[PDB]
Structure formats: structure tokens, C-alpha cells
Design a protein around this ligand. Structure first.
Ligand SMILES: [Mg+2]
Ligand SMILES: [Mg+2]
Ligand SMILES: [Mg+2]
Ligand SMILES: [Mg+2]
Ligand SMILES: [Mg+2]
Ligand SMILES: [Mg+2]
Ligand SMILES: [Mg+2]
Lengths: 77, 149, 117, 190, 51
RNA sequence: GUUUAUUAAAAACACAGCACUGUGCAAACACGAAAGUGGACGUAUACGGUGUGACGCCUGCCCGGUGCCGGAAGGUUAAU
RNA sequence: UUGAGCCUUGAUGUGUAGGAUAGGUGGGAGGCUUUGAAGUGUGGACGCCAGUCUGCAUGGAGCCGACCUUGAAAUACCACCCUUUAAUGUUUGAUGUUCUAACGUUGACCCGUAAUCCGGGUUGCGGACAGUGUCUGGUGGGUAGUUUGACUGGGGCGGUC
């Protein structure tokens, strides 16, 4: 399900607003990309299905912390 | 990102600088093959402790692997009890573990492979000289005097 | 730019027109000028004179690689076949070898039918 | 430099040949290129001019003593009107027109001094200083500057001959000061 | 065809070209095919060269 | 042969045959927010779309318009 | 590498009376060249082949000005430049060349595993493209929602408001 394992970011609904302001239900998906990550701490690639925002957070926090978060809400990776 | 490097790293790095690199390069190549690391600030001072230590401290300790030779010219003469054949020409002869072992064995403590008697190394009596080695650039001269007793 | 001094003067002399190109040896082409491109159009250019002035224009255009001497390969019938070569000699060229290369099939394609004029 | 190097005139006979050619903007919309009635400069410069006026047989006794030399007479309006090699410069204003003796067919004479109370009044200056510098083709500016008798002393034509920034049209940025001549050429910025 | 002429002269001297090709097999192959009509041309070209 | 089960069986649909056009295969194209699947366990002598409709003799002129294909120097032109 | 700006630098002008292939104003009655010149002799070169510039060079030492005409006068020299152009750079793209490590693999293989899925691993092929997200111009009866007036000797047509 198009959900980012780092941040929760999942698709959300809104409208397309034409020039004449007609609305039409639509969605905003997030920017997912499954990406391989080298955890030094476990001599292994862990691949996460992340949003782009996802990665940036993983940078600043560090895959070790971010994974630690997953492991702490029974997220399986 | 900023990221601080580890090894020398080609057209950008140094060995422990704070360059700034495209994240595509940092993740995917550098940091994974640990040639650099996130400049997490926590780190950038992990490196400031590493900007005082080994450098400022252990180079005035190679100012001791150097001032060992401030006691190479303040004596400037050991004698070897080596005699003389048929005209004041050594009945003995003295090399490196002779000029490092007859250097150590006093107040002049040198490492046996720190005594350059270019060969003469050696084939006669009286005064000679040698090139004493403690540092790569700072060695020092003495005077050796094979005493025919 | 560049310089060579040893070259070739390929002249394409047909019935309606004759074209002239000075190439180096490697057939690498150094400057050209043509009969129709020097004025005279129609019958005008189908003349040995037009071919002469073509050769002059041509030299004043490859004397840019100070071409001291040059072979001369002559293709096609029609005027300015030779008169063009005369202008090369005068112009001031060391005129080495002279060939005729006008292509001759060993009876191959069917040539055009008509000419009920 | 930050302003100008007037020592950047450092082998004619003098460096008066040094010209205020600063730039001005396009005609993008409707704008023009106008130099005033003799642009003076807060420098006197030291020019004893030669001014020819359309004055009368009346002011030939004082309209010649104020940074000038002669004054064309009233019989010499069409008396000296039979020559090509025989025939600032002035024209008093208001209802005085000069196409009956200054119109035909290629020189520039127009601005002078307008005075019917005094032909040389105590305070009436700004004339024996500088000239004009009007439209040339793409721009204007053309004149001269100071001399080999200046320094940062005739660099008062930089804050008062570049201060000569006037109304511009729309879609322009008119500036680019540059003087010098009869030796080398250049300047800085604005 | 080819003349790599040599030392001290400038004249064309190419009288060789009127010894083979040029308008030889060239005015020839130029135009109307021919076919059986050469036969007639070269048949009149022997009736002549008898006398 | 098929077809309006229940007012139309036909000259209507289909049909073999023909033409145009798409598709290099993870094909086009189709069902699918997607995974997956038909096409096909096939591969241009194949697969899709479209029109015409055994066969015989044949199938002319028009590219301005509307579609479509190619193109590009200019002009005009979006977030930014 | 190449398109567009921006900044220095160097090119060139056959309207008529005429010493002559006069760009426009402006400084402007001497600068220049032995810091080695005119004019012969070629080199690259622009081009309406009309003629120009120049590095190299043979060279070897003065030319000019209102000059009277021309609507406007000096190759006397100097400027900010337009005609259009040409070259290094600075900037911004874009287009192109490589790499592998992101990402694709609907090649081969190893294990989970007696498994045509899936995961991991190895290898081969691609590779910063492709693809996807957000934003954005075009297209879009494929879908969708609707509009498509009233008078009228019935309505419609015509006409009328
Ligand atoms: Mg039946
Ligand atoms: Mg029925
Ligand atoms: Mg088919
Ligand atoms: Mg039919
Ligand atoms: Mg038809
Ligand atoms: Mg509808
Ligand atoms: Mg009604």
C-alpha cells in the first residue's frame, strides 16, 4: 500500500479545481521509491519503501535511528 | 549535504575536511563505502577533539625524536677499544650495532638501526665520523675515535 | 589556416556546365568554383570561357593553402574540358600530372531514350 | 576607481581633448536626448569663448565683454549674406525667429543669453564654461572635459556632469561614463 | 588517359584523348539506347568503307 | 451459415478473398488505481484495428477543406 | 562541444557639383613613425571578385588642414558607437562523450524449498537514462454534468423582442 515506512505519508484526497472552480475528487499520492540502505550496524542492505521526504529524514536522523523507530512499532524490515 | 570525509577522496576530499557533497553521491557511494559521514554537528566536534590531539601534541613529541640529537653533539665522542696492526690501522672495526651499542650503553640511548657508518664502515684507527638517525629529516653528527689499547 | 602545397585539380566538365575542385592528395577538397557560379547562365555557362574564369576564381580560393603544384584529373566531355586547365597553368601553377577519368561503363545501364528535337 | 581616475590622463600638446561621453537610454516608448542652453559645469574651466550673437547696433559696447569676443550687427544679417566660405552662438528668445537668416541648407547655433535690461549684468554667468553635446545616432553625450591643468579638480564634472541624469522613457538604464582622448581611452562605472 | 609529363615545358600535348575515350565511347553511350539500328548504322558503315 | 427468444429471416450480420494501418515483444492492444493477466506459452508468412466483401473485368481526376504523417528556421507560448 | 545573454577587444561604409569606394555627431590646427613608415611581393581572409585589412617580409624615411566646391570636411589623430560581423572569457542552459554506486531487468545461476509466486545472494545486461511522485502547457464525445429563450390565429419555417 503506497505508504512510506519512515513517515506514514499515505495518499490523501482533495479536489481538482478547474478554472470555473468545478471540483472533482482526486488524490495526492506520496513520492515513493523503494531504496536499498546500507546499515553498517548489521552488515546488510535493508530496503525501505520510502517517500522522498522519507529519505531526507533518514539522512538527518540516520538509518540506525529510523530503523530503531520501525523496530519499536513492530514494523517489520 | 555537508558531510565530513574519512580517507583522502579524489577531486574534492582531503582526509578529514568538511566538504559539501550532492546527496546522491553521499548515500550510494561515499558513506556506505565509509569514505565520509553526515556532518551531524555531534560529529563536527567529535572532530574538534580530533583537531587538538594527535597533531599539536605528538609533533613536539617528535621534537623529542629530534632533541635526542641535542645530546648527540654535546658529547660528540665515544671511543672504541680497537687496536692497530702494523701502523695505527685498526686491529678492530666498528659498524652500526657497534656504534649504536657503543652509543646506547651510556647516556646516549639510540635504536641500533639509527647509526649510519657509511661503511668505513670501517678499516683503520683514530677519529672518524657517522650519521645518527632518530627522525626522517633530523639525524645528527658525532665523532668516533677507535682507541688502540 | 592549414597549408599543403601538393594537391589535385579535379574538373567536372559536362555539356551544360563544368565544375572545378582543388583537393589535396587525400581527395580532401580545398576549394571549388563552377562555371555557372561565376555569372553566365544557360548557354552562357556551357562555354570554354566560363570554364576559364571558373579556374581563376578557383585558384583565388585555394591559393589559401599555398598550393605550389597539383595533379589534374579531367572528367566529362563538353567545353571547358581543357580550356580550364590552361587557366590553371597561367594562374601560376606547377602542373605535374594529367589524367582523364571520364567514367566508361562496360555497357551497363540503359541510357535515356528520347531526344526527338 | 570608485569615482574616476583623472590622473588616468597620464603625448599631445595638452589633454583638454578628454570627452564626457557617458551613456544614455534607448527610445523605448517616447524619450529624447537634450543638452541644455550651454551646459556650464561648476568649473569655470578657463575658456575665453568666441560668441556671435544676432544683437544690434546698440549692444556693440558691452555684449562683447563677458566671456566672448564680437557681436554680429543688424546690417550684417543679410549684408554678410552672400558667402559659403564667407558665411557659443546666440538668439534672444520670445517672439524672435531666425529662419530668415539662420535656417537654410547644417551647423548648431541657438542658445546664448536673453537680456533687454543688461547686455552684461553683474551676475549672468554659466556661459564661458562649456558647450553642447546632443544626439548623434544611437545615443548622444559628445563633448570634452577639463585639461592637462586639472586632477581631481576637474573631477567636479563627474558629480556635476554625470549628475546630468535626466528623464528616461521606459525600458532603459542609461549610464556608462567615459572620457579621455588624443592619447588613450577609458573610465570606470556609475 | 594519363600523362605524367616531365621537365621543361607547359603545353597540353594531350593528343592522347583523341586516341580512345572522350567523344569515342561517350557521344556513344550518351543517349538513345539504339538496339537493332546499330546493326543498321554499322551496316551502312561497311557499305561506305568498301569504296 | 447468422439475426431482431415474443409482429421484421431479409437486399441486414458474418463469411473466404482483398486493401489500408498499427505492432521488435516487458509488442501493439485489451481487463486492471495496483500486483497480476489476456495477446501467447505466440514473434512480422505473427498479433491487433479499420474498411471492402467469392469470382471475372476493372478500380480514373482532386490534398483547398477536415483528419492523419513528417518537419522545422522563425513567431507565439506553461510551471519555473 | 554548441545555442543565448553580458564584458573588453579589432573589422567597415562605390547619394550629386569634387584633389576621392565622405557612417552620424563631438574633442579637434598637429599627431604620428626610428617603441623602425610609405609602396612594391606573397602568405590567412571577408565578399554585390568592386576592393579592403593585416601578421611575415623586401623595404628604408615624410605625409597633412579651412584649403575654392559639398545641406554636412578630413586616412591629421582620438572617442562613446550604429551598418553587420569575427574572435578568447564570464554566465545560463542545452546537446553530446565516459564511469558505477542510486534505480530497471518480463537473461543465467545459488539458497530458503522437491516451489513457473516471493525474498535474499551471485553473475550477466542496462544505467543516472527509463520509470514513478508534485507541479505545469497541449490533447482528450473516451467518460461525465448540463444548456440549447419566448411571441405565434396549433407547432415549425419566415418574422419579431
Ligand atoms: Mg440459408
Ligand atoms: Mg419477431
Ligand atoms: Mg490482419
Ligand atoms: Mg458491405
Ligand atoms: Mg478511388
Ligand atoms: Mg454527452
Ligand atoms: Mg411557444
Amino acid at each position: 500500500s503506497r505508504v512510506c515506512q519512515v513517515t506514514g505519508k499515505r495518499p490523501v484526497t482533495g479536489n481538482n479545481r478547474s478554472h470555473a472552480l468545478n471540483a472533482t475528487k482526486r488524490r495526492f499520492l506520496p513520492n515513493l521509491h523503494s531504496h536499498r540502505f546500507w546499515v553498517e550496524s548489521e552488515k546488510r542492505f535493508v530496503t525501505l519503501r520510502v517517500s522522498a521526504k522519507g529519505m531526507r529524514v533518514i539522512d538527518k536522523k540516520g538509518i540506525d535511528t529510523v530503523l530503531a523507530e520501525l523496530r519499536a512499532r513492530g514494523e517489520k524490515y | 549535504m555537508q558531510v565530513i570525509l574519512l580517507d583522502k577522496v579524489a577531486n574534492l576530499g582531503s582526509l578529514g575536511d568538511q566538504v559539501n557533497v550532492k546527496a546522491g553521491y553521499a548515500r550510494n557511494f561515499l558513506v556506505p563505502q565509509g569514505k565520509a559521514v553526515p556532518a551531524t554537528k555531534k560529529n563536527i566536534e567529535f572532530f574538534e577533539a580530533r583537531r587538538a590531539e594527535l597533531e599539536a601534541k605528538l609533533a613536539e613529541v617528535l621534537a623529542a625524536a629530534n632533541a635526542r640529537a641535542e645530546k648527540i653533539n654535546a658529547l660528540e665522542t665515544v671511543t672504541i677499544a680497537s687496536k692497530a696492526g702494523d701502523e695505527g690501522k685498526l686491529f678492530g672495526s666498528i659498524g652500526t650495532r657497534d656504534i649504536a651499542d657503543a652509543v646506547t650503553a651510556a647516556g646516549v640511548e639510540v635504536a641500533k638501526s639509527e647509526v649510519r657508518l657509511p661503511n668505513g664502515v670501517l678499516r683503520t684507527t683514530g677519529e672518524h665520523e657517522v650519521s645518527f638517525q632518530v627522525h626522517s629529516e633530523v639525524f645528527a653528527k658525532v665523532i668516533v675515535n677507535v682507541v688502540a689499547e | 589556416r592549414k597549408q599543403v602545397s601538393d594537391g589535385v585539380a579535379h574538373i567536372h566538365a559536362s555539356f551544360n556546365n563544368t565544375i572545378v575542385t582543388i583537393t589535396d592528395r587525400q581527395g580532401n577538397a580545398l576549394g571549388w568554383a563552377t562555371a555557372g557560379g561565376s555569372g553566365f547562365r544557360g548557354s552562357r555557362k556551357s562555354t570554354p570561357f566560363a570554364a576559364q574564369v571558373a579556374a581563376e576564381r578557383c585558384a583565388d580560393a585555394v591559393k589559401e593553402y599555398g598550393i605550389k603544384n597539383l595533379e589534374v584529373m579531367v572528367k566529362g566531355p563538353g567545353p571547358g574540358r581543357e580550356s580550364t586547365i590552361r587557366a590553371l597553368n597561367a594562374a601560376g601553377f606547377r602542373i605535374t600530372n594529367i589524367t582523364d577519368v571520364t567514367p566508361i561503363p562496360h555497357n551497363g545501364c540503359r541510357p535515356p531514350k528520347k531526344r526527338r528535337v | 576607481k570608485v569615482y574616476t581616475i583623472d590622473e588616468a590622463a597620464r603625448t599631445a600638446k595638452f589633454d583638454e581633448t578628454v570627452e564626457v561621453h557617458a551613456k544614455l537610454g534607448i527610445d523605448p516608448r517616447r524619450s529624447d536626448q537634450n543638452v541644455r542652453g550651454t551646459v556650464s559645469l561648476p568649473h569655470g574651466l578657463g575658456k575665453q569663448v568666441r560668441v556671435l550673437a544676432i544683437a544690434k547696433g546698440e549692444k556693440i559696447k558691452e555684449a562683447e565683454e563677458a566671456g566672448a569676443d564680437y557681436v554680429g550687427g543688424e546690417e550684417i544679417i543679410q549684408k554678410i549674406l552672400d558667402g559659403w566660405m564667407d558665411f557659443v552662438m546666440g538668439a534672444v528668445g520670445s517672439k524672435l525667429g531666425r529662419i530668415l537668416g539662420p535656417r537654410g541648407l547644417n551647423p548648431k547655433a541657438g542658445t546664448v543669453g536673453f537680456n533687454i535690461g543688461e547686455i552684461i549684468r553683474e551676475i549672468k554667468a554659466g556661459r564661458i564654461e562649456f558647450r553642447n553635446d546632443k544626439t548623434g545616432a544611437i545615443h548622444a553625450p559628445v563633448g570634452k572635459a577639463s585639461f592637462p591643468p586639472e586632477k581631481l579638480a576637474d573631477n567636479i564634472r563627474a558629480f556635476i556632469r554625470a549628475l546630468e541624469a535626466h528623464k528616461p522613457e521606459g525600458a532603459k538604464g542609461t549610464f556608462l561614463r567615459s572620457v579621455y582622448v588624443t592619447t588613450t581611452m577609458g573610465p570606470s562605472v556609475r | 588517359i594519363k600523362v605524367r609529363e616531365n621537365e621543361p615545358f607547359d603545353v597540353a600535348l594531350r593528343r592522347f584523348k583523341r586516341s580512345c575515350e572522350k567523344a569515342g565511347v561517350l557521344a556513344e553511350v550518351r543517349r538513345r539506347e539504339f538496339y537493332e539500328k546499330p546493326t543498321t548504322e554499322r551496316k551502312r558503315a561497311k557499305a561506305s568503307a568498301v569504296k
